[PDB]
Amino acid sequence: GCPRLLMRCKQDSDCLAGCVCGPNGFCG
Numbered sequence: 001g002c003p004r005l006l007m008r009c010k011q012d013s014d015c016l017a018g019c020v021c022g023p024n025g026f027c028g
Contacts, residue, residue, distance in 0.1 A: 005026075006026050009025070
């Protein structure tokens with residue numbers, strides 16, 4: 001599964017397996 005919260009990203013893998021780097025700053 002893919003949660004959601006203010007978690008800054010730089011790459012897809014940044015977040016938990018399922019999410020992508022949300023085009024804004026934080027995961028999406």
